[PDB]
Amino acid sequence: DRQTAQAAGTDTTITLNVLAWLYAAVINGDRWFLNRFTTTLNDFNLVAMKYNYEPLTQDHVDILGPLSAQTGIAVLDMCAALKELLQNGMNGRTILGSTILEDEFTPFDVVRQCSGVTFQ
């Protein structure tokens, strides 16, 4: 079954937005899943695509740039954190009090969410 998802020109998880939502958790005060490794961009993609995700790129990396800068976590480190959550499926710990990997937040939206009386 599946393997080659996204044949519908659609259907893939927005990998960018899951990484943004992980940064949103770090911002909010919920960083337990963070790691010390910096996985390869393409090796990350090879894991990610197995779970119905889009391939990440240098362009996607650049869009996370502000969040990465704000938190001090490189995108390749956030990739490695996300690799753990893929392999474990979240394991049972929540992130942002949610029980699933959410993808509804673009990096810019998470940036904007920082405007809680500071700006940025």
- What secondary structure does DSSP assign to 56-109, as a single string? P-HHHHHHHHHHHHHHT--HHHHHHHHHHHHHHTTBTB-BTTBSS------HHH
CA–CA distance, 79 with 113 (Å, rounded to integer): 22
Backbone angles phi, psi at 30, to 5 degrees: -135, 65
> What's the number of domains the chain is made of?
1
Reduced to 3 states (helix: H, G, I; strand: E, B; else coil), residue 38 is coil
Residue linked to tokens 């690799």: 83
Nearest by Cα to 18 from 67, 69, 72: 67
Range of the domain at 61: 1-120
The crossing angle, in degrees rounded to 10, of helices 15-28 and 58-71 is 0
Number of Cβ atoms within 10 Å of the Cβ of 107: 22
CA–CA distance, 113 with 28 (Å, rounded to integer): 10
Experimental method: NMR
CATH number at residue 6: 1.10.1840.10
Identify whether the C-beta of residue 27 lies closer than 8 Å to the C-beta of residue 71.
yes
